[PDB]
Curated annotation (Swiss-Prot), chain D:
It is found in: Plastid, Chloroplast thylakoid lumen. The keyword Cell cycle does not apply. This is Photosystem I reaction center subunit III, chloroplastic. It comes from the Eukaryota.
Length: 198, 42, 215, 153
């Protein structure tokens, strides 16, 4: 289940295969140090999960708007829309809440199993768990966190980060929605590619 | 052939090849993107 | 007695490119088309010799395909079964896509397989395409001469009718002839301003004239 | 209008400088027939000059009282492409070069005769380490965090 990103190339020594989603893809030797690899696993997990949520948010509402079920602005035009609060207050609230929750996450990263307890209602505490996969309240449906689920999550995360990079680059070069780009590609692929937008 | 490749790996020959490739790249960039005072892509 | 599937090196008294001369010490006749021709000593390093042998094989196969795809359609146009064939102007024709996007798609598709071949050359057996059937035993192929179900669906290699060395020298010799032919066609298309078979027709008639010295 | 500088697309002196350049080029052009190679070269130079002046006007550059564009490096967001963006690009490339050189020096440090690998560069290792500087900021930041960037002697 390990596999190879390049069949000819051999896997690095520090990528034995204990970590989920291990295909031996460290050509630049970024994760040679074990502390660096430990940090990069968490960074990959958080970036991939945020990319999942982001790509869903910039793809599915646009698809539903194009279908006609709802009328939602584009992901690049959603900032200028009207809400009950201004963008600055929302940013401040998000900054406060994210400071708290990400400081808690950083404490778990620095020393695992140290911030599992509620600070207000001390009778509530998370069960012992591996770093990056906090069970208990974050897993209400009690899905089994097998290594197959971790590998699937990492694969979908890598695909989502690639999709977000495609999203931002495509909007930078064409100035239109990614699903609009997909429709333009599906209109006639051989004259609607990367080439004819330059 | 190994000795000739070792000679090609010595400092002046490798420096000449590297700097010639770099100079050619810069000259071609200056031909295709001439008179660049700012970075206007962003 | 049976079918030998190993290349047999040529004897040291093999015919050479320059008879009466001493063949170089790094050319011992183990390679296809080995005639002891290395004035510049480019094959002194055995690793570079293997890389150059693979490069010569690749250039041979591409040149044979190229010269076939030039000559056979040109021979069809002269017969009359092709309306407006011209290999020099074939690149500037109108197709269903632009040449740039076709080039990018070709680059991706061909850099898949050229890179699988690279991995095979670096690590023999790392990529296997021939199926591993339950009791069929797959023989280990040489680097640059693969082929089970796909590349050698005829089983004409591996010691069948002509020994592997004989067929490999035949391939290499036809390839060298095709490389020289393709370079000649490329120079003739810009020098004579005409086609290959037309140039052959005006050279066969009055060969004392209509040459390199009369454009 | 930062520091009392008019924009180059709304500057009379910028157009005046373009007029002098085009007039000098036309005076040089008048000596040759229009179908000749020097005339074509002069015409290409004039077209390049016109494109340069139009691009300088449209780029948002601020022109001084002498008709020449003046760069602003104070960090103003309207002029981030004059210094800050090329500065970031240069810092990235220079960090790439420095990180690749440092990695090559570290790799050949524990050899029998390391100096032989400096007068004669070992090309395969250098080409292996060339692309390691693509992610030079991440590697440098982690090495600084793990205390591997510096040597305590
Ligand atoms: C995840 C990072 C993030 C990214 C990549 C963008 C990206 C973008 N936003 Mg958004 N935003 C982001 C978070 C946020 N934005 C906003 C609120 C806005 C506003 C109010 C506006 C943008 C605008 C823009 C565009 C140019 C800046 C660009 C599409 C602007 C726009 O829509 O295009 C000019 C704009 O006016 N964003 C808030 C609330 C404060 C965010 C909270 O994190
Ligand atoms: C790989 C070998 C290759 C070779 C030897 C040639 C050779 C040639 N091409 Mg071709 N081409 C080749 C690949 C390709 N060409 C083209 C697209 C073109 C165009 C668009 C044109 C040529 C033309 C020419 C001629 C250049 C003078 C020359 C006969 C030119 C011609 O008209 O002469 C036949 C021409 O204008 N080629 C593409 C797609 C980008 C290629 C992709 O591999
Ligand atoms: C591989 C074999 C080969 C063959 C059969 C031909 C055939 C032909 N060529 Mg081409 N040609 C070739 C390679 C070849 N060429 C090469 C390698 C180049 C340059 C790099 C050229 C460049 C060329 C030019 C510039 C011209 C021709 C023309 C011609 C005609 C000969 C008259 C002459 O003046 O050219 C001789 C030209 C040479 C440069 C000699 C190259 C010979 C190479 C180095 C070796 C071939 C020898 C070898 C024994 C081949 C076996 C022969 C046979 C069994 C196939 C004839 C139709 C002429 C034409 O058609 O005018 C009407 C002409 O103008 N050719
Ligand atoms: C968001 C950042 C990110 C991070 C931190 C990681 C982190 C990790 N990757 Mg993952 N990966 C990512 C994105 C990321 N990946 C993406 C987008 C893909 C799909 C192309 C993959 C596919 C992948 C494979 C196939 C493999 C890994 C593996 C690894 C591990 C070792 C390599 C390393 O640490 O590089 C650290 C990397 C970064 C800090 C990235 C920074 C961005 C660079 C500097 C440039 C930005 C480029 C972009 C095009 C613009 C480590 C857990 C290996 C493994 O063993 O898994 C456990 C493995 O074989 N990754
Ligand atoms: C993850 C998959 C993904 C997919 C399905 C698409 C899909 C699409 N892209 Mg996007 N794109 C992506 C990622 C992706 N992109 C990334 C990572 C980048 C940054 C380099 C871009 C940058 C980009 C540009 C600059 C353009 C497009 C455009 C296009 C469309 C036309 C094809 C094109 O011209 O060349 C596609 C070009 C690419 C560089 C291919 C990237 C594919 C990555 C490497 C994953 C492939 C892996 C797997 C086998 C699938 C096509 C529908 C074009 C357009 O505007 O549409 C009308 C266009 O101009 N894309
Ligand atoms: C003190 C340092 C210094 C600096 C900062 C500059 C700055 C500049 N020079 Mg000047 N110059 C200098 C010293 C310097 N020069 C000296 C000593 C000489 C005499 C030898 C010159 C002679 C000179 C000439 C003859 C020209 C310039 C020009 C340029 C411009 C950039 C050229 C270009 O188009 O890049 C384009 C971008 C790049 C090459 C970036 C490459 C990055 C690679 C591709 C990586 C991409 C990343 C992935 C820029 C204003 C050009 C100009 O038109 O000025 C307005 C030009 O024609 N300079
Ligand atoms: C070595 C590789 C090679 C290459 C790169 C080419 C390249 C080309 N061929 Mg040639 N060809 C070759 C070998 C090759 N041929 C062989 C072995 C034959 C059999 C004799 C032909 C017979 C041939 C014909 C009959 C025609 C071309 C034509 C074409 C052009 C476009 C058609 C095409 O490629 O898409 C088609 C792709 C499919 C998979 C279908 C292009 C210049 C066309 C042409 O001349 O353009 C006007 C055309 O009419 N070729
Ligand atoms: C020009 C002559 C030539 C010769 C003598 C050889 C010789 C050799 N090759 Mg090489 N090869 C060539 C050209 C040639 N090759 C080309 C152009 C390519 C690129 C496609 C390759 C790539 C290649 C591969 C990938 C493999 C070989 C292998 C071999 C062996 C098989 C025997 C043979 O090919 O049949 C000798 C007879 C012929 C070549 C006659 C010419 C064929 C005519 C022109 C057309 C074929 C007819 C018909 C259209 C095909 C059937 C139709 C069907 C698809 C419906 C032998 C050592 C195999 C290997 O070494 O494994 C041990 C291996 O699998 N070759
Ligand atoms: C003058 C006499 C001469 C003689 C006796 C030979 C003899 C031979 N040739 Mg060579 N050959 C010659 C001139 C000659 N050649 C010339 C002028 C050319 C053009 C450059 C070639 C190019 C050539 C090719 C392309 C091939 C042979 C092949 C063969 C061998 C296969 C025999 C058949 O059957 C045989 C040893 C075959 C061989 O063994 O190579 C694979 C083959 O396919 N020959
Ligand atoms: C690994 C490795 C290895 C070797 O060794 C070296 C190298 C190669 C260097 C490395 C690397 C690689 C790679 C490829 C990477 C990539 C990355 C990415 C792309 C990420 C993303 C990432 C991404 C992400 C997170 C994303 C996110 C997103 C989000 C939040 C979103 C948001 C939003 C939404 C929803 C909606 C609205 O309307 C808008 C907004 C507001 C905007």
């Amino acid at each position: 289940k390990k596999g190879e990103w390049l069949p000819g190339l051999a896997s690095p020594g520090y990528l034995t295969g204990s970590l989920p989603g291990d295909n031996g893809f460290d050509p630049l030797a970024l994760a040679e140090d074990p502390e660096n690899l430990r940090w990069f696993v968490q960074a990959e997990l958080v970036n991939g999960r945020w990319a999942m949520l982001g790509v869903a948010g910039m793809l599915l509402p646009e698809v539903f708007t194009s279908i006609g079920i709802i009328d939602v602005p584009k992901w690049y035009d959603a900032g200028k829309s009207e809400y009950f609060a201004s963008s600055s207050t929302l940013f401040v609230i998000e900054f406060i809440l994210f400071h708290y929750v990400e400081i808690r996450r950083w404490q778990d990263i620095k020393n695992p199993g140290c911030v599992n307890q509620d600070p207000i209602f001390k009778q509530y505490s998370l069960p012992p768990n591996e770093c990056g996969y906090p069970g208990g309240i974050f897993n209400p449906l009690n899905f089994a966190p097998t290594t197959e689920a971790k590998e699937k999550e990492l694969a979908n995360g890598r695909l989502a980060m690639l999709a977000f990079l495609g999203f931002i680059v495509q909007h930078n070069v064409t100035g239109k929605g990614p699903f609009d780009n997909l429709q333009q590609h599906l209109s006639d692929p051989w004259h609607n590619t990367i080439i004819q937008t330059f | 052939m190994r000795d000739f490749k070792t000679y090609l790996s010595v400092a002046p020959v490798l420096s000449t090849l590297w700097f010639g490739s770099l100079a050619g790249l810069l000259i071609e960039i200056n031909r295709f993107f001439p008179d660049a005072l700012t970075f206007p892509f962003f | 007695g049976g079918i030998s599937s190993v290349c047999e090196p040529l004897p040291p008294d093999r015919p050479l490119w320059f008879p009466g001369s001493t063949p170089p010490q790094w050319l011992d006749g183990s390679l296809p088309g080995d005639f002891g021709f290395d004035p510049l000593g480019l094959g002194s390093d055995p690793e570079t010799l293997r890389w150059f042998a693979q490069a010569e094989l690749m250039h041979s196969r591409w040149a044979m395909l190229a010269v076939a795809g030039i000559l056979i359609p040109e021979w069809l146009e002269s017969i009359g079964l092709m309306e407006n064939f011209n290999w020099y102007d074939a690149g500037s024709r109108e197709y269903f896509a632009d040449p740039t996007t076709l080039f990018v798609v070709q680059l991706a598709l061909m850099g898949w397989v050229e890179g699988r071949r690279w991995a095979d050359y670096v690590n023999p057996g790392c990529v296997d395409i021939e199926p591993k059937l339950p009791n069929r035993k797959n023989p280990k192929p040489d680097v640059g001469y693969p082929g089970g179900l796909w590349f050698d669906f005829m089983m004409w290699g591996r010691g069948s009718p002509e020994p592997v060395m004989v067929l490999r020298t035949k391939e290499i010799k036809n390839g060298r002839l095709a490389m020289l032919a393709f370079v000649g066609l490329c120079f003739q298309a810009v020098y004579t301003g005409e086609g290959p078979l037309e140039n052959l027709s005006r050279h066969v008639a009055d060969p004392g004239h209509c040459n390199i010295f009369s454009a | 209008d930062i520091a009392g500088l008019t924009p180059c697309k709304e500057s009379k002196q910028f157009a005046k400088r373009e007029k002098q350049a085009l007039k000098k080029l036309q005076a040089s052009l008048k000596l040759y027939a229009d179908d000749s190679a020097p005339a074509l070269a002069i015409k290409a130079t004039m077209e390049k000059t016109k494109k340069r002046f139009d691009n300088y006007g449209k780029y948002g550059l601020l022109c001084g009282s002498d008709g020449l564009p003046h760069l602003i490096v104070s960090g103003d967001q309207r002029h981030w492409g004059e210094f800050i963006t090329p500065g970031i690009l240069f810092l990235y490339i220079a960090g790439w070069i420095g990180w690749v050189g440092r990695s090559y020096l570290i790799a050949i440090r524990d050899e029998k005769k390391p100096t032989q690998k400096e007068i004669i560069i070992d090309v395969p290792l250098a080409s292996s380490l060339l692309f390691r500087g693509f992610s030079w900021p991440v590697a440098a930041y982690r090495e600084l965090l793990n205390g591997e960037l510096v040597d305590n002697n």
